[PDB]
Design an enzyme around this catalytic site. Structure first.
Site, PDB file in Angstrom:
ATOM      1  N   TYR A  13       1.637   9.076  36.059  1.00 45.09           N
ATOM      2  CA  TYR A  13       1.469  10.089  35.030  1.00 45.09           C
ATOM      3  C   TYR A  13       2.084  11.396  35.472  1.00 45.09           C
ATOM      4  O   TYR A  13       2.764  12.077  34.702  1.00 45.09           O
ATOM      5  CB  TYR A  13      -0.020  10.281  34.725  1.00 45.09           C
ATOM      6  CG  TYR A  13      -0.628   9.088  34.036  1.00 45.09           C
ATOM      7  CD1 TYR A  13      -0.569   8.955  32.652  1.00 45.09           C
ATOM      8  CD2 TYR A  13      -1.201   8.051  34.775  1.00 45.09           C
ATOM      9  CE1 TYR A  13      -1.071   7.818  32.017  1.00 45.09           C
ATOM     10  CE2 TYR A  13      -1.703   6.911  34.152  1.00 45.09           C
ATOM     11  CZ  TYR A  13      -1.632   6.801  32.778  1.00 45.09           C
ATOM     12  OH  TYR A  13      -2.135   5.687  32.157  1.00 45.09           O
ATOM     13  N   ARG A  42      -1.296  -5.914  27.627  1.00 46.16           N
ATOM     14  CA  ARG A  42      -2.164  -6.003  28.808  1.00 46.16           C
ATOM     15  C   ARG A  42      -3.541  -5.459  28.447  1.00 46.16           C
ATOM     16  O   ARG A  42      -3.661  -4.353  27.917  1.00 46.16           O
ATOM     17  CB  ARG A  42      -1.585  -5.189  29.984  1.00 46.16           C
ATOM     18  CG  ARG A  42      -2.302  -5.458  31.330  1.00 46.16           C
ATOM     19  CD  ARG A  42      -1.857  -4.510  32.451  1.00 46.16           C
ATOM     20  NE  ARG A  42      -2.262  -3.165  32.126  1.00 46.16           N
ATOM     21  CZ  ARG A  42      -2.884  -2.317  32.934  1.00 46.16           C
ATOM     22  NH1 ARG A  42      -3.185  -2.637  34.183  1.00 46.16           N
ATOM     23  NH2 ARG A  42      -3.205  -1.114  32.466  1.00 46.16           N
ATOM     24  N   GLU A  46       0.991   1.145  33.344  1.00 47.23           N
ATOM     25  CA  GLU A  46       0.500   2.300  32.604  1.00 47.23           C
ATOM     26  C   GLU A  46       1.331   3.553  32.840  1.00 47.23           C
ATOM     27  O   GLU A  46       1.666   3.901  33.979  1.00 47.23           O
ATOM     28  CB  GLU A  46      -0.963   2.630  32.944  1.00 47.23           C
ATOM     29  CG  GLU A  46      -1.921   1.453  32.859  1.00 47.23           C
ATOM     30  CD  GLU A  46      -3.374   1.848  33.054  1.00 47.23           C
ATOM     31  OE1 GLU A  46      -4.219   0.940  33.157  1.00 47.23           O
ATOM     32  OE2 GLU A  46      -3.674   3.062  33.102  1.00 47.23           O
ATOM     33  N   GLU A 103      -5.931   0.159  39.722  1.00 49.68           N
ATOM     34  CA  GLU A 103      -6.228   1.361  40.497  1.00 49.68           C
ATOM     35  C   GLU A 103      -7.416   1.297  41.460  1.00 49.68           C
ATOM     36  O   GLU A 103      -8.454   1.929  41.212  1.00 49.68           O
ATOM     37  CB  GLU A 103      -6.442   2.519  39.519  1.00 49.68           C
ATOM     38  CG  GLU A 103      -5.437   2.517  38.380  1.00 49.68           C
ATOM     39  CD  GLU A 103      -5.261   3.885  37.778  1.00 49.68           C
ATOM     40  OE1 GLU A 103      -6.236   4.660  37.790  1.00 49.68           O
ATOM     41  OE2 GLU A 103      -4.164   4.184  37.282  1.00 49.68           O
ATOM     42  N   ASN A 145       0.984   2.485  37.982  1.00 48.91           N
ATOM     43  CA  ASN A 145       0.579   3.413  36.919  1.00 48.91           C
ATOM     44  C   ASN A 145       1.004   4.793  37.423  1.00 48.91           C
ATOM     45  O   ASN A 145       0.687   5.159  38.558  1.00 48.91           O
ATOM     46  CB  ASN A 145      -0.944   3.464  36.719  1.00 48.91           C
ATOM     47  CG  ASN A 145      -1.532   2.175  36.166  1.00 48.91           C
ATOM     48  OD1 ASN A 145      -0.823   1.193  35.925  1.00 48.91           O
ATOM     49  ND2 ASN A 145      -2.860   2.176  35.964  1.00 48.91           N
ATOM     50  N   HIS A 193     -11.341  -3.556  35.540  1.00 46.55           N
ATOM     51  CA  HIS A 193     -10.922  -2.231  35.103  1.00 46.55           C
ATOM     52  C   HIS A 193     -12.065  -1.211  35.126  1.00 46.55           C
ATOM     53  O   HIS A 193     -12.330  -0.521  34.138  1.00 46.55           O
ATOM     54  CB  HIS A 193     -10.265  -2.298  33.723  1.00 46.55           C
ATOM     55  CG  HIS A 193      -9.195  -1.268  33.512  1.00 46.55           C
ATOM     56  ND1 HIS A 193      -9.434   0.088  33.609  1.00 46.55           N
ATOM     57  CD2 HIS A 193      -7.893  -1.392  33.165  1.00 46.55           C
ATOM     58  CE1 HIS A 193      -8.329   0.753  33.326  1.00 46.55           C
ATOM     59  NE2 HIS A 193      -7.379  -0.121  33.051  1.00 46.55           N
TER      60      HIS A 193
HETATM   61  O1  LIG Z   1      -5.611   9.432  32.521  1.00 51.99           O
HETATM   62  C1  LIG Z   1      -6.602   8.480  32.159  1.00 51.99           C
HETATM   63  C2  LIG Z   1      -5.991   7.093  32.368  1.00 51.99           C
HETATM   64  O2  LIG Z   1      -5.648   6.969  33.781  1.00 51.99           O
HETATM   65  C3  LIG Z   1      -5.062   5.705  34.272  1.00 51.99           C
HETATM   66  O3  LIG Z   1      -4.867   5.907  35.619  1.00 51.99           O
HETATM   67  C4  LIG Z   1      -6.251   4.804  34.099  1.00 51.99           C
HETATM   68  O4  LIG Z   1      -5.830   3.472  34.614  1.00 51.99           O
HETATM   69  C5  LIG Z   1      -6.555   4.594  32.588  1.00 51.99           C
HETATM   70  O5  LIG Z   1      -7.694   3.660  32.493  1.00 51.99           O
HETATM   71  C6  LIG Z   1      -6.987   5.975  32.033  1.00 51.99           C
HETATM   72  O6  LIG Z   1      -7.230   5.852  30.622  1.00 51.99           O
END
Ligand SMILES: OC[C@H]1O[C@@H](O)[C@H](O)[C@@H](O)[C@@H]1O
Length: 445
Positions: A295, A76, A353, A164, A293, A119
């Site tokens: 984290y 992607r 992501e 996002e 996405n 993006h």
């Molecule tokens: O933590 C940084 C990363 O966050 C993701 O939410 C973003 O989509 C990525 O573009 C970024 O590199």
């Protein structure tokens, strides 16, 4: 204690145009809002800018091959708007040819691409006309999305519209943390409405053209926990969830903005005037899949400060990445379950992501990033548990194939599974990458 994923599961890797391409003033590309933003003192760590970055603009063939060598069947990437529409209605053929060649390489290595339309790299000239705060920008986007769909599409199996929306709007025009860097809530909510409309715009262009590639928007989402059982903390946490999650997901699936949040933003919405007849209907178009996405999660408590949400994030020092982000895979499982329960309810889910930035160190020509590993593995277990229980997770893309310009953090943070030596621009796969290769080989671990 083995984790084997479906046979059809989609394993891929993901990047971003501004974060890896470089060649900012090459091939006719004009400055994007980030090119301007990065020059403002204090906005980006070390004053770093996307100039050169990984120089993927020149190394794309070696990268795509590197992907193949690594056993990836999906890739992607995003298109840099500034390379296509360098100025008011002009269509830079040179920019288009770049992506065409990139695609020639992808198809040659036997990979399946996913093109991300936006993006965050909005052309600067557009920002001068008002940026995402102007309805007119949606037309400029219509022009852009159309050109790409016509020039391509016959070979784009997967269409990713907006990556996002939350970041581009709230952080870009609200908190000032992302380009263009404004600090105006009215502008931020107006921009979020406009960016969401563009997903719907691209969705109409997709249907009006009869393209066969799956399409869908990508929303970053995070699981929210209350810092304590205290009532105001629970309320605080509801507010954070509506702020990042529900404000974007609600319109996408339900055709409306969270009533509570609408009441909370009060005067900042100015009566929801920026909302015109048809808009919500335009925005509410889930498509064939929901890109997500993830984290980390947030632990929220309330405050009575001057901030928009009057909320405070509890910074866990527990397992965290090099960015201070807590590693809580369990929350990922809970988020996914929650997502299917509301909004999603069955639609194919795709994690566009997921990954982590850990302090890397090169030893004997290799990168023993056990951490970034304890991280991807554990989150994949969370994805496995989501499936096995009925979840509709159809794929997973590890964020950042290469170390890159990590926005506000600049180059100080490395999210790649492939190490980039910025002094020589040489690529060197990290252990996590090799692991991912074996894992994909056995389709599990
Ligand atoms: O933590 C940084 C990363 O966050 C993701 O939410 C973003 O989509 C990525 O573009 C970024 O590199």
């Amino acid at each position: 204690n083995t984790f084997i994923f479906p046979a059809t599961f989609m394993w891929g890797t993901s990047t971003s145009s501004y974060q890896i391409e470089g060649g900012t003033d090459e091939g006719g590309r004009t400055p994007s809002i980030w090119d301007t933003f990065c020059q403002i003192p204090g906005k980006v760590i070390g004053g770093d800018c996307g100039d050169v970055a990984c120089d993927h603009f020149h190394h794309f063939k070696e990268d795509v091959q590197l992907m193949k060598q690594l056993g990836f069947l999906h890739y992607r990437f995003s298109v840099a708007w500034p390379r296509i529409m360098p100025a008011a209605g002009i269509i830079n053929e040179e920019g288009l040819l770049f992506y065409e060649h990139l695609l020639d390489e992808i198809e040659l290595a036997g990979l399946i691409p996913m093109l991300t339309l936006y993006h965050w790299d909005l052309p600067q000239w557009i920002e001068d006309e008002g940026g995402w705060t102007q309805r007119e920008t949606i037309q400029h986007f219509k022009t852009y999305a159309s050109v790409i769909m016509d020039r391509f599409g016959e070979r784009i199996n997967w269409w990713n519209t907006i990556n996002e929306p939350y970041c581009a709007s709230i952080l870009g025009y609200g908190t000032g943390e992302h380009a263009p860097g404004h600090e105006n809530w009215r502008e931020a909510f107006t921009a979020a409405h406009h960016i969401l409309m563009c997903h719907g715009i691209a969705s109409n262009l997709h249907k009006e053209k009869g393209l066969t590639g799956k399409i869908g928007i990508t929303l970053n989402m995070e699981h929210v926990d209350a810092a304590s059982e205290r009532p105001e903390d629970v309320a605080a946490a509801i507010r954070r969830d509506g702020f990042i999650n529900r404000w974007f997901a609600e319109p996408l699936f339900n055709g409306k903005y969270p009533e509570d949040m609408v009441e909370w933003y009060g005067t900042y919405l100015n009566g929801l005037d920026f909302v015109q007849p048809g808009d919500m209907e335009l925005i509410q178009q889930p498509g064939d899949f929901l890109g997500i996405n993830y984290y980390t999660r947030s632990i929220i408590r309330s405050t009575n400060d001057a901030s928009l949400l009057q909320v405070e994030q509890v910074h866990m020092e527990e397992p965290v990445t090099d960015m201070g982000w807590e590693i809580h895979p369990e929350s990922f499982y809970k988020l996914l379950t929650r997502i299917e329960k509301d909004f999603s309810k069955g639609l194919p889910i795709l994690i566009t992501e997921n990954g982590a930035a850990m302090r890397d160190e090169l030893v004997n020509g290799q990168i023993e990033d056990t951490g970034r590993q304890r991280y991807i593995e554990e989150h994949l277990k969370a994805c496995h548990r989501f499936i096995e229980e009925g979840g509709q997770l159809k794929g997973y893309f590890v964020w950042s194939f290469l170390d890159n310009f990590e926005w506000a953090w600049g180059y100080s943070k490395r999210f790649g599974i492939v190490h980039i030596n910025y002094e020589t621009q040489e690529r060197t796969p990290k252990q996590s990458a090799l692991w991912f290769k074996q894992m994909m080989a056995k389709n599990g671990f």
